[PDB]
C-alpha cells in the first residue's frame, strides 16, 4: 500500500529509471518529423511519466497529497506534462497548438539530478536579484532611444531613388507618386557588391548618390524593416543592439551614411558609454554572485632494476615532443613530394621513440601499480592512437602529446586545470549550460522548424536552404550556440521573416538573456575556481630654460601642432598646393625645433642622465627618423630605396605627446609594466592555438580554394561544371574561371593563426566557416553542405581556444594585478510651508514622467492631426516647467542657492524656450530642437539616489561615478592610438580597392574618413571587412597596375603590412581596454 | 488667397517681441494691416498682420518648417 509505494519510490533503481526515460526521450524529441514506426513510443513515455506521478501521489498516501506534498514547483511541471500529453492524445480539432510543449519534459532531468535542482534554483534567485539594475538599464536605453529617435527619425529610410518624379504622372501610377517612389525598389540602388539598398543624405557630410540618382526619403524601412530608428519601440531595439555590440558595425555604417559623418559622435558616445556601462553592469552582477558566495625468470628481473633506478630522460623526451610539434608545423598547403615523404618519416620516427619510451616506462616501473598514475594512462592512450593511426583527422591524434609540457610549464598546467575544472568541481554548472542549450535547441526547433522549411524562399537569397536555420536539430544547436557568442541579431531577422515578430522576440531574447546569464555564470565560476667658466655658464642657462614652464609648454603645444601636420598628409595634397608648400616649410622647422630640444636636454643633464629615461630614447628615435629623412633630401640620391619608409615612420610623432602628458604617461607605464606577465600567457595561447592551426591544416589545407567565373563573384556548381582544381584549369578555355583560395584560411600554420583569430574574436568567422564546412576534397570544389559536420571543430575550438584561453587570460591579469599591488508676502509664506512636503516633488516627477511618455509616443510622419496635438502638449509642457521653476525659485530666500540641480533646471528650460522661438533655423543647423527637451528626463535619476529600498542601483551608480575619470584617460590613449594608426593607414591604405568594409564613405583616403574606420575597429566590429581588400593581391578580384595620382601605383593593398596593421591594432586596443577596465576596477574595490 | 504670420524662408516665421513695437515695419511693408504676435506651434512666436497676398511668404504646414 502507501508503505509499499514509499518503499519503491525512494529506491535507487527509480532515479536511474526516470533519468533513463528522460534521456531516451531527449534523443527522440530531438528528431524532426520522426517516422511513425518507432515514433509512437511517445505514449509509452506517457506511461512511464504517469506511472511515476501515480507512485508519487500514492507514496504520500491520501487526498491531501496534491495539497501538502506536491507544493514543490518542479512537480507542477510533472503534472503539466501529464495533463498536456493527455490533452493532446485523449482529446484534440488539432491546430497543433500544444505539441510545442513536449520539451517541458527535458527539465525533468533537472528535477531528478540532485544538483541541477540546486543550480537552477540559485540561478533564478540571481535573476531575481538583478531586477533593479535591469530597470535602471532599460531606463537608460529608453532615454537614449529617444535621443536616437529624435536625431535619426526616419533617417534610416533614405534611399537613392532613381532621379525621377519627372512631371505629371497624374500623380504617380507610373514607373517609367508614392506608388513607384515606394513600392518599386526597382527604382532604388543597391550598395556596391551587395544586395542592399543604398542609403544617402541631404547633409554635406552624409554619403551621396551617383549622378542621375535622387536622394528621396520615401522607401521601405532599412535592412528588413527591423532596424528603423523611427518610433520608440524600434528605437529601443536598435539601441539595445548597440549596447551589446551585436553587429552594430552594420547599423553604424547605415546611419552615418544617412545622417552624415558628423553624427559619429552619437555612436561614439553610445558605444563608449554603453560598453562601459555594460562592463559596469556585469561587474555589479558579478559582485552579487560573489556576495552570495561570501554569505554562504631471473634474467628479466635483473634488466628492469637497472632502468628504473637511473632516470634523467624527461629533459631529453620533452625536447623531442617540442621538436615533434615543430615538425608537424612545417606541413603546409603544397609540400613537395620529397618533403611530403620526408615529413611522414619523421612522424614514424617520432612515434617509435615514444612507443619505445612507453615500453621502457612500463617495465622499469611497475606494470600494474606504477602505470595506474593518471598522467601515464593518458600518455599511453596517445601512443596507442598513434599506432592505430599508422595501423583527414586520422593524423591529428599525435597533437595531444604537446600537453606533456604542462608538467614543466607553470602556465600550461594552469590552463589544463581550468579545462579539468570545467568538467570537475564546477562540472554541475557545465551540465546545466549543456541542458539549457539542448532545451532551447529543441524548443527552438519545435516552434520554428515548420516555418523555416515552408518559407525558405523568404529568408534565403537564392533558392537553397539558408545557412543558419532551426529545421535540423544539429543546425538548431548551432544557432543556439551562435546566440551564446553574442551574434543574435543577424539570425533574429531571418526567423522573424518566416515566424512573425511576436514569437521570435520572446524566445530569442529569452535565449539571449538566459544563455548569456548561464554562460557568464559558468565563465565566472571557472575564474573563481582557478585562483672652463664658459662651459659652466652654458650649463646654467640651458638648465634654466628647460626648467622654465613656458618652454615646456611651448614644446607641448609644438608637438600638438606637429601632429596636426600629419593630418593634412592625405591623398588631397596635390590639390591643396598652398598648404603643401607650408607643410614642407613646417616639416623642416619641426625637425629643427625637436632636434634643438634634444641637444638642450643633453647639455642640461649630460649623456648619462638623459639616456636613463625610456621616454628620452623614444623621443630620440622619432627625431632621428625625421633627421635621417631630412639629411637624405639635402645630401642627394633621393626618391630611391627605403626613403619612403622612413617618411611613413613619422606617424609616431604623436607618441612624444605621451611623455609630457601626465595622464597619458601614467597609463602607458602601467600597461607596459604588466607586459612580462602578459607575455608568458601569450605563449600558452600561442601553444594552444598552435594545436588547432596544425590540426586545421591537416583537416583543411587546400580544401578552401574554390572560386568560379568572374561575373558571378561566388563559387560555381560543385558537382556540375567544375569539381576539381585540375578540372577548373581544363575548363578555363575562357578567361572567366579563376581558382582562388579564400582570403583567410588555414593553408600554412602562420595563415592558420590568422584564421583562428577571426574565429576567436567572432568577427569574420562566417566566411571562414562556410569555406571550411563546405570542403569536399583536397583539391576539389566545395559542395554546398558536403562535410557539414565540420562546425564541430569550430565549436570545439571556440569553447577551448577562445573561451578557455580568455578565461585563463582574464585570470592571470587579475592575478598579476593583485600580486603587483601586494608586492609593493502671504504667497511666500505658503510656498515656504509647502516646499518641505515630499508630495510636491513627486508631482513634478509625474509631469516629467508624463512628458517622457509624450516623447515616447511619436513615430515618423504619424498624422497631420497628431503632430499638432503633440506639439501643443509639448508647448504646454515647456511652459509648465518654466512656470514651475520660477515660482519655486525663491520659496525660501536661499532656495536657488541650496540645490545645484535646481539652478541646472533653469539652464535647460531657457535653452528649450529659445529653441521653439528660434526654431526656423535651428532644425537644419542643430541635430533637432526637440532633442533638448530629453535632458529633463535625466533629472529623474535624482530620485534614484533618494529611494531607500534598492541598494543594487547604488553600487552600479557608485561604480560608474568612481571609475568615471579613468574612462576619459583610457579614451584619450585610445584616441591617440587611433590617430597614429590612421596616419600609418593613410600612407599605406590610400587607393585600396573599394571592396567590403572599405566602401566610398569609409576609406583610409582622408583623415576624417580614417578615424571613422579605426573607431569601429576599436571594439573589433568589422575588422574582418576592412582587412579583406587589403589582403588581396592580383586579379581576378584586384588590379596589379592602375594609374594613381600619387606615385603608389595600383589599387591593391599589401598583405604583409595589412595583416600586420590590423592584427596588432586589434590586439593593442584589446590590451588597452582590458587592462584598463580591469585595473581601474581592481583599484576601485 | 494664402495668408499667414510674418514668414521666413524657406517656410518658418519671423520674430515679434513682448510689445506692440516688435516688427511692425517689415510686416506693414509686406502688405499687412493688423498687429499682434502668437506662438506658432512647433515653429515659434510669430506676429500676424492680415490681408497678405501670395507675393510674400506665409506660414505653410504639413511636414515641418524646413530649410
Ligand atoms: C525578455 C522578454 C522581452 C519580451 C518583449 C517582447 C515583446 C514583443 C512585442 C512586440 O511586438 O513589439 C514590437 C517591437 O518589439 C521590440 O522591438 C522591443 C525590443 C525589446 C528589447 C528587449 C530589451 C531587453 C532588456 C533586458 C513592436 O513593433 P511593431 O509596433 O509591431 O512594428 C510594426 C511595424 N511592422
Ligand atoms: C509566456 C507566454 C507568452 C506567449 C506569447 C506568445 C505570443 C505568440 C502569439 C501567437 O499567435 O503565436 C502563435 C503560436 O503560438 C505558439 O504555439 C507558441 C506557444 C509557446 C508557449 C510556450 C512558451 C515557453 C517559452 C520558453 C502563432 O503566431 P503567428 O500567427 O504565426 O504570428 C503572428 C504574427 N505576430
Ligand atoms: C601582438 C603581435 C601579433 C603580431 C602579428 C604579426 C603578423 C605579421 C606576420 C605577417 O605579416 O605575415 C605575412 C603573411 O601572412 C600569412 O600568410 C600568415 C601570417 C599569420 C599572421 C599571424 C597573426 C598572429 C595573430 C596572433 C594570434 C595570437 C607576411
Ligand atoms: C575576491 C574579490 O576580488 C574580485 C573583485 C572583482 C574582480 C576583479 C574579480 C572577480 C570577477 C572579475 C570580473 C570578470 C568579469 O568578466 C570580464 C571580462 C570578460 C567578460 C566575459 C566580462 O567581464 C571582466 C571585464 C569582468 C571582471 C574582470 C571585473 C573584475 C572582477 C576579483
Ligand atoms: C566611381 C565611383 O563612383 N565609385 C564607386 C566604384 O567603386 C564602383 O565600382 C562604381 C560601380 O558601382 O561606382 C561606385
Ligand atoms: C527628406 C529629405 O531627405 N529631403 C531632402 C530635401 O532637402 C530635398 O528637397 C529632397 C528632395 O528629394 O532630398 C533631400
Ligand atoms: C524642388 C524639389 O526638389 N522638390 C522636393 C520635393 O520633391 C520633396 O518632396 C521635398 C522633401 O521631401 O523637398 C523638395
Ligand atoms: C586526384 C584528383 O582529385 N584529381 C581530379 C579527380 O577528381 C579526377 O581525376 C578528375 C575528376 O575529378 O579530375 C581530376
Ligand atoms: C578515381 C578517378 O580519378 N576517377 C576520375 C573520374 O572521376 C573523372 O570523372 C575522370 C574524368 O575527369 O577522371 C578520373
Ligand atoms: O504628396 C506629395 C508632395 O509632397 C510635398 C511636396 O514634396 C510635393 O512636391 C509632393 O508632390
UniProtKB/Swiss-Prot annotation, chain A:
<dbReference type="GO" id="GO:0019899">
    <property type="term" value="F:enzyme binding"/>
</dbReference>
<dbReference type="GO" id="GO:0086002">
    <property type="term" value="P:cardiac muscle cell action potential involved in contraction"/>
</dbReference>
<feature type="transmembrane region" description="Helical; Name=S5 of repeat II">
    <location>
        <begin position="426"/>
        <end position="447"/>
    </location>
</feature>
<keyword id="KW-0851">Voltage-gated channel</keyword>
<keyword id="KW-0812">Transmembrane</keyword>
<feature type="topological domain" description="Extracellular">
    <location>
        <begin position="858"/>
        <end position="868"/>
    </location>
</feature>
<feature type="transmembrane region" description="Helical; Name=S1 of repeat III">
    <location>
        <begin position="548"/>
        <end position="569"/>
    </location>
</feature>
<dbReference type="GO" id="GO:0014704">
    <property type="term" value="C:intercalated disc"/>
</dbReference>
<dbReference type="GO" id="GO:0005783">
    <property type="term" value="C:endoplasmic reticulum"/>
</dbReference>
<feature type="topological domain" description="Extracellular">
    <location>
        <begin position="153"/>
        <end position="231"/>
    </location>
</feature>
<dbReference type="GO" id="GO:0001518">
    <property type="term" value="C:voltage-gated sodium channel complex"/>
</dbReference>
<dbReference type="GO" id="GO:0060372">
    <property type="term" value="P:regulation of atrial cardiac muscle cell membrane repolarization"/>
</dbReference>
<keyword id="KW-0472">Membrane</keyword>
<keyword id="KW-1133">Transmembrane helix</keyword>
<feature type="transmembrane region" description="Helical; Name=S6 of repeat II">
    <location>
        <begin position="502"/>
        <end position="530"/>
    </location>
</feature>
<feature type="transmembrane region" description="Helical; Name=S2 of repeat IV">
    <location>
        <begin position="869"/>
        <end position="890"/>
    </location>
</feature>
<keyword id="KW-0739">Sodium transport</keyword>
<dbReference type="GO" id="GO:0086062">
    <property type="term" value="F:voltage-gated sodium channel activity involved in Purkinje myocyte action potential"/>
</dbReference>
<keyword id="KW-0677">Repeat</keyword>
<dbReference type="GO" id="GO:0050679">
    <property type="term" value="P:positive regulation of epithelial cell proliferation"/>
</dbReference>
<dbReference type="GO" id="GO:0050998">
    <property type="term" value="F:nitric-oxide synthase binding"/>
</dbReference>
<feature type="topological domain" description="Extracellular">
    <location>
        <begin position="700"/>
        <end position="744"/>
    </location>
</feature>
Swiss-Prot record, chain B:
<dbReference type="InterPro" id="IPR036574">
    <property type="entry name" value="Scorpion_toxin-like_sf"/>
</dbReference>
<keyword id="KW-0528">Neurotoxin</keyword>
<feature type="domain" description="LCN-type CS-alpha/beta">
    <location>
        <begin position="2"/>
        <end position="66"/>
    </location>
</feature>
<protein>
    <recommendedName>
        <fullName>Alpha-like toxin Lqh3</fullName>
    </recommendedName>
</protein>
<feature type="disulfide bond">
    <location>
        <begin position="16"/>
        <end position="37"/>
    </location>
</feature>
<dbReference type="GO" id="GO:0019871">
    <property type="term" value="F:sodium channel inhibitor activity"/>
</dbReference>
<keyword id="KW-0738">Voltage-gated sodium channel impairing toxin</keyword>
<dbReference type="InterPro" id="IPR002061">
    <property type="entry name" value="Scorpion_toxinL/defensin"/>
</dbReference>
<comment type="similarity">
    <text>Belongs to the long (4 C-C) scorpion toxin superfamily. Sodium channel inhibitor family. Alpha subfamily.</text>
</comment>
<dbReference type="GO" id="GO:0005576">
    <property type="term" value="C:extracellular region"/>
</dbReference>
<dbReference type="InterPro" id="IPR044062">
    <property type="entry name" value="LCN-type_CS_alpha_beta_dom"/>
</dbReference>
<comment type="function">
    <text>Alpha toxins bind voltage-independently at site-3 of sodium channels (Nav) and inhibit the inactivation of the activated channels, thereby blocking neuronal transmission. The dissociation is voltage-dependent. This alpha-like toxin is highly toxic to insects and competes with LqhaIT on binding to insect sodium channels. Differs from classical anti-mammalian alpha-toxins as it inhibits sodium channel inactivation in cell bodies of hippocampus brain neurons, on which the anti-mammalian Lqh2 is inactive, and is unable to affect Nav1.2 in the rat brain, on which Lqh2 is highly active.</text>
</comment>
<feature type="modified residue" description="Serine amide">
    <location>
        <position position="67"/>
    </location>
</feature>
<keyword id="KW-0964">Secreted</keyword>
<keyword id="KW-1015">Disulfide bond</keyword>
<keyword id="KW-0800">Toxin</keyword>
<keyword id="KW-0872">Ion channel impairing toxin</keyword>
<feature type="disulfide bond">
    <location>
        <begin position="23"/>
        <end position="47"/>
    </location>
</feature>
<dbReference type="GO" id="GO:0090729">
    <property type="term" value="F:toxin activity"/>
</dbReference>
<comment type="subunit">
    <text>Monomer.</text>
</comment>
<feature type="disulfide bond">
    <location>
        <begin position="27"/>
        <end position="49"/>
    </location>
</feature>
<keyword id="KW-0027">Amidation</keyword>
Amino acid at each position: 500500500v502507501r508503505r509499499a509505494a514509499v518503499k519503491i519510490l525512494v529506491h535507487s533503481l527509480f532515479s536511474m529509471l526516470i533519468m533513463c526515460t528522460i534521456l531516451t526521450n531527449c534523443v527522440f524529441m530531438a528528431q524532426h518529423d520522426p517516422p511513425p514506426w518507432t515514433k509512437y513510443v511517445e505514449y509509452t513515455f506517457t506511461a512511464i511519466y504517469t506511472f511515476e506521478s501515480l507512485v508519487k501521489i500514492l507514496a504520500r498516501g491520501f487526498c491531501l497529497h496534491a495539497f501538502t506534498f506536491l507544493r514543490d514547483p518542479w512537480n507542477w511541471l510533472d503534472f503539466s506534462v501529464i495533463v498536456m500529453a493527455y490533452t493532446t492524445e485523449f482529446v484534440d480539432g488539432n491546430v497543433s497548438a500544444l505539441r510545442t510543449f513536449r520539451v517541458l519534459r527535458a527539465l525533468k532531468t533537472i528535477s531528478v539530478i540532485s544538483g541541477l535542482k540546486t543550480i537552477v534554483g540559485a540561478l533564478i534567485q540571481s535573476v531575481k536579484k538583478l531586477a533593479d539594475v535591469m530597470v535602471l538599464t532599460v531606463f537608460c536605453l529608453s532615454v537614449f532611444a529617444l535621443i536616437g529617435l529624435q536625431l535619426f527619425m526616419g533617417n534610416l529610410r533614405h534611399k537613392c531613388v532613381r532621379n525621377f518624379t519627372e512631371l505629371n504622372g497624374t500623380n504617380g501610377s507610373v514607373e517609367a507618386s508614392l506608388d513607384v517612389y515606394l513600392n518599386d525598389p526597382a527604382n532604388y540602388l543597391l550598395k556596391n557588391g551587395t544586395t542592399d539598398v543604398l542609403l544617402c543624405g541631404n547633409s554635406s557630410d552624409a554619403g551621396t548618390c551617383p549622378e542621375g540618382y535622387r536622394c528621396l526619403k520615401a522607401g521601405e524601412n532599412p535592412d528588413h524593416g527591423y532596424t528603423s530608428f523611427d518610433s520608440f519601440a524600434w528605437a529601443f531595439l536598435a539601441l539595445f543592439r548597440l549596447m551589446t555590440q551585436d553587429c552594430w558595425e552594420r547599423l553604424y555604417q547605415q546611419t552615418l551614411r544617412s545622417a552624415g559623418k558628423i553624427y559619429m559622435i552619437f555612436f561614439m558616445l553610445v558605444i563608449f558609454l554603453g560598453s562601459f556601462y555594460l562592463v559596469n553592469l556585469i561587474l555589479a552582477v558579478v559582485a552579487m554572485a560573489y556576495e552570495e558566495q561570501n554569505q554562504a625468470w631471473m634474467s628479466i628481473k635483473q634488466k628492469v632494476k637497472f632502468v628504473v633506478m637511473d632516470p634523467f630522460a624527461d629533459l631529453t623526451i620533452t625536447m623531442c615532443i617540442v621538436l615533434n610539434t615543430l615538425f608537424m608545423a612545417l606541413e603546409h598547403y603544397n609540400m613537395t613530394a620529397e618533403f611530403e615523404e620526408m615529413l611522414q618519416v619523421g612522424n614514424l620516427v617520432f612515434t617509435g621513440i615514444f612507443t619505445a619510451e612507453m615500453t621502457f616506462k612500463i617495465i622499469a616501473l611497475d606494470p600494474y601499480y606504477y602505470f595506474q598514475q593518471g598522467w601515464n594512462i593518458f600518455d599511453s592512450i596517445i601512443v596507442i592512437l598513434s599506432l592505430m593511426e599508422l595501423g583527414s583527422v586520422l593524423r591529428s591524434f599525435r597533437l595531444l602529446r604537446v600537453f606533456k609540457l604542462a608538467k614543466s610549464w607553470p602556465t600550461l598546467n594552469t590552463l589544463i586545470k581550468i579545462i579539468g575544472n570545467s568538467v570537475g568541481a564546477l562540472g554541475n554548472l557545465t551540465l546545466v549550460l549543456a541542458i539549457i542549450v539542448f532545451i532551447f535547441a529543441v524548443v527552438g526547433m519545435q516552434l520554428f522548424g515548420k516555418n523555416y522549411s515552408e518559407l525558405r524562399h523568404r529568408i534565403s537569397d537564392s533558392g537553397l536552404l539558408p545557412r543558419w536555420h532551426m529545421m535540423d536539430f544539429f543546425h538548431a544547436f548551432l544557432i543556439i550556440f551562435r546566440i551564446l557568442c553574442g551574434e543574435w541579431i543577424e539570425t533574429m531577422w531571418d526567423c522573424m521573416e518566416v515566424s512573425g515578430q511576436s514569437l521570435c522576440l520572446l524566445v530569442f531574447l529569452l535565449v539571449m538573456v538566459i544563455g548569456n546569464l548561464v554562460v557568464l555564470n559558468l565563465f565566472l565560476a571557472l575564474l573563481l575556481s582557478s585562483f672652463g667658466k664658459v662651459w659652466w655658464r652654458l650649463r646654467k642657462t640651458c638648465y634654466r630654460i628647460v626648467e622654465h614652464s613656458w618652454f615646456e609648454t611651448f614644446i607641448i603645444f609644438m608637438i600638438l601642432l606637429s601632429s596636426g601636420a600629419l593630418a593634412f598628409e592625405d591623398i588631397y595634397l596635390e590639390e591643396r598646393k598652398t598648404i603643401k608648400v607650408l607643410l614642407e616649410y613646417a616639416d623642416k622647422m619641426f625637425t629643427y625645433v625637436f632636434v634643438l630640444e634634444m641637444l638642450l636636454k643633453w647639455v642640461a643633464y649630460g649623456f648619462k642622465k638623459y639616456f636613463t629615461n625610456a621616454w628620452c630614447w623614444l623621443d630620440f628615435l622619432i627625431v632621428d627618423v625625421s633627421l635621417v629623412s631630412l639629411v637624405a633630401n639635402t645630401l642627394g640620391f633621393a626618391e630611391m630605396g627605403p626613403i619612403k619608409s622612413l617618411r611613413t615612420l613619422r606617424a609616431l610623432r604623436p607618441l612624444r605627446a605621451l611623455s609630457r602628458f601626465e595622464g597619458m604617461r601614467v597609463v602607458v607605464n602601467a600597461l607596459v609594466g604588466a607586459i612580462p606577465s602578459i607575455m608568458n600567457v601569450l605563449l600558452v595561447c600561442l601553444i594552444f592555438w598552435l594545436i588547432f592551426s596544425i590540426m586545421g591544416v591537416n583537416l583543411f589545407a587546400g580544401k578552401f580554394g574554390r572560386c568560379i567565373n568572374q561575373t558571378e563573384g561566388d563559387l560555381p556548381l560543385n558537382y556540375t561544371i567544375v569539381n576539381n582544381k585540375s578540372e577548373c584549369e581544363s575548363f578555363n578555355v575562357t578567361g572567366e574561371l579563376y581558382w582562388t583560395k579564400v582570403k583567410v584560411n588555414f593553408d600554412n600554420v602562420g595563415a592558420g593563426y590568422l584564421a583562428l583569430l577571426q574565429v576567436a574574436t567572432f568577427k569574420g568567422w562566417m566566411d571562414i566557416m562556410y569555406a571550411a564546412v563546405d570542403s569536399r576534397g583536397y583539391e576539389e570544389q566545395p559542395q554546398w553542405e558536403d562535410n557539414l559536420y565540420m562546425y564541430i571543430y569550430f565549436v570545439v575550438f571556440i569553447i577551448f581556444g577562445s573561451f578557455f584561453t580568455l578565461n585563463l587570460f582574464i585570470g592571470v591579469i587579475i592575478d598579476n594585478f593583485n600580486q603587483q599591488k601586494k608586492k609593493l508676502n502671504k504667497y511666500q509664506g505658503f510656498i515656504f510651508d509647502i516646499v518641505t512636503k515630499q508630495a510636491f516633488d513627486v508631482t513634478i516627477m509625474f509631469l516629467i514622467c508624463l512628458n517622457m511618455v509624450t516623447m515616447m509616443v511619436e513615430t515618423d510622419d504619424q498624422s497631420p492631426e497628431k503632430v499638432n496635438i503633440l506639439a501643443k502638449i509639448n508647448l504646454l509642457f515647456v511652459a509648465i516647467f518654466t512656470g514651475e521653476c520660477i515660482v519655486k525659485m525663491a520659496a525660501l530666500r536661499h532656495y536657488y542657492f541650496t540645490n545645484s540641480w535646481n539652478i541646472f533646471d533653469f539652464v535647460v528650460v531657457i535653452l528649450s524656450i529659445v529653441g521653439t522661438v528660434l526654431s526656423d533655423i535651428i532644425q537644419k543647423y542643430f541635430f533637432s530642437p526637440t532633442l533638448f527637451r530629453v535632458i529633463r528626463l535625466a533629472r529623474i535619476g535624482r530620485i534614484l539616489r533618494l529611494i531607500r529600498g534598492a541598494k543594487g542601483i547604488r553600487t552600479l551608480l557608485f561604480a560608474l561615478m568612481m571609475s568615471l575619470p579613468a574612462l576619459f584617460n583610457i579614451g584619450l590613449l585610445l584616441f591617440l592610438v587611433m590617430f597614429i594608426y590612421s596616419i600609418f593607414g593613410m600612407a599605406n591604405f590610400a587607393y585600396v580597392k573599394w571592396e567590403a568594409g572599405i566602401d566610398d564613405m569609409f576609406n583610409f583616403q582622408t583623415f576624417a574618413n580614417s578615424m571613422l574606420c579605426l573607431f569601429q575597429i576599436t571594439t573589433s566590429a568589422g575588422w574582418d571587412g576592412l582587412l579583406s581588400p587589403i589582403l588581396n593581391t592580383g586579379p581576378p578580384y584586384c588590379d596589379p597596375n592602375l594609374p594613381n595620382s600619387n606615385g603608389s601605383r595600383g589599387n591593391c593593398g599589401s598583405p604583409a603590412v595589412g595583416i600586420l596593421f590590423f592584427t596588432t591594432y586589434i590586439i593593442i586596443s584589446f590590451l588597452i581596454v582590458v587592462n584598463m577596465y580591469i585595473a581601474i576596477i581592481l583599484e576601485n574595490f | 488667397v494664402r495668408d499667414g504670420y510674418i514668414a521666413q524662408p524657406e517656410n518658418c516665421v519671423y520674430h515679434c517681441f513682448p510689445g506692440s513695437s516688435g516688427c511692425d515695419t517689415l510686416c506693414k511693408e509686406k502688405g499687412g494691416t493688423s498687429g499682434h504676435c502668437g506662438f506658432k506651434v512647433g515653429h515659434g512666436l510669430a506676429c500676424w498682420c492680415n490681408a497678405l497676398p501670395d507675393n510674400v511668404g506665409i506660414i505653410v504646414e504639413g511636414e515641418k518648417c524646413h530649410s
